[PDB]
Amino acid sequence: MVLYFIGLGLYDERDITVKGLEIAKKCDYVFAEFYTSLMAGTTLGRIQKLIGKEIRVLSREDVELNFENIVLPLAKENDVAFLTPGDPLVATTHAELRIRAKRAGVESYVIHAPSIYSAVGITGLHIYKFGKSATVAYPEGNWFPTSYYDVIKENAERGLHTLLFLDIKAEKRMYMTANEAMELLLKVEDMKKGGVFTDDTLVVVLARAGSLNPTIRAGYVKDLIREDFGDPPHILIVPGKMHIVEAEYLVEIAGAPREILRVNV
Template sequence: MLYIIGLGLADEKDISVKGLDIVRKAERVYLEAYTAILLVDKEQLEAYYGRPVILADREMVESQSDEILKDAETKDVAFLVVGDPFSATTHTDLALRCRQNDPPIPTRTLPNASILTAVGATGLSLYNFGQTVSMVFFTDSWKPSSFYDRIAENASLGLHTLVLLDIKVKEPDLQAMARGKIIYEKPRFMTVAQCASQMLEVEDERQQGVCGKEALAVGVARLGSEDQQIVAGTLEELSTADLGRPLHSLVLCGKKMHEMEWEFVREFAVDQGTFDQVWKSVYGAQK
């Protein structure tokens, strides 16, 4: 059987008791290592689990899944996922491959906390969130802005938008590849400040008032850990905020933010005076 096991958000101890029992008995244990990362390294997981852990990068999961699924019809294989197993479509695809295998490989999923639910720690109601979007690193020649349309749809309904920020793990250096060499870039993780800056840049082009300088947002870092950080403010304020080491995410607040949400979130504000002023003149006025 293939066990797809959620690890939660922070460290080796966030795994469920059921998940830990399976990991300690499985024939092989893989750690998916590119859609998200834990805040501890592989060696710390291995020490706690008492088992060797095989890192599964994008190439292995997407192109060499047969290696992961080898003998899973008769042996137990554990596939570990940061957060919740089905928060990324990659893992849905892996489960589908198990169904399509001949003979089919039985699967079992063990859920866990993910950013999609942990973001409730900001005080923003999960009932008031719309579509989740992703923000990628801009380059000089590539600045995709399709996220803006999804945020605009959410904004038209007064809903919050969770923005998941880009990470680059084991990304090939394209210039080196052109010379016939396989060299990987240093890992990069987008910050709240980078995300806010890119949103403002796209707003300057679109001019629809979806994510302007005075739009209220909440930046989060390392949710679920002992040193988690939550900072609220305008996008302009967050464009210079420093929330420390990864992983970061950002929430753009919807205009129908309830008073209870406002009261909770304002405690995280960079400047409570500015936060209150914007909320009362724009957000509270929507009531």
């Protein structure tokens, strides 16, 4: 009579922790969602084989509206697991689901897994220097989201890096690329003209973290805006004031122009 929130990790089914695997293998019922992120290197079938269980995939509606009707009822008489990409509580609203579990008298536990939030470390940028985070959302109809632009501005002013989560529309199999993110940003820049994101802005792209060969690229928007970074998922990062070893890493590892080695202090 327990509910387990278990992260599956960044790229494939092997990104789950041993703890998460062993516990999942022994749960009576296994549920999962694949709309909060994209695990590019695996399939539902492969996950099921590893875990040795049939997995009922839930939609955003099933979860956000009927979690307490579809999942919780079972966790009252069985060991239930709810799997998610990356870490179940990072950049999702799944934390609120623990409140529902409690109000239903269902104890819940959380098994973490590698998350894109900490994986940014592979970019060479000191993780403690990241400021507020944001999401570049797809414009819809006449509505054009722009808040993520202000986040970059605020962080840049303090010299902090900015992690930009990119939009996703799983049901339509749409995964925003870093290129689309850059195009949207230049459009916002054209509107606000704050000198926040231009063709000369240095950016970093991390694609398919978790795989053995993720794409890690750094450079100016003008050079990267049309570059192919491979299949999604992707994240875009706007560095703040860099330390010398950060720039050196971006150059030696992310193929950035040696030009950035000459850091301004």
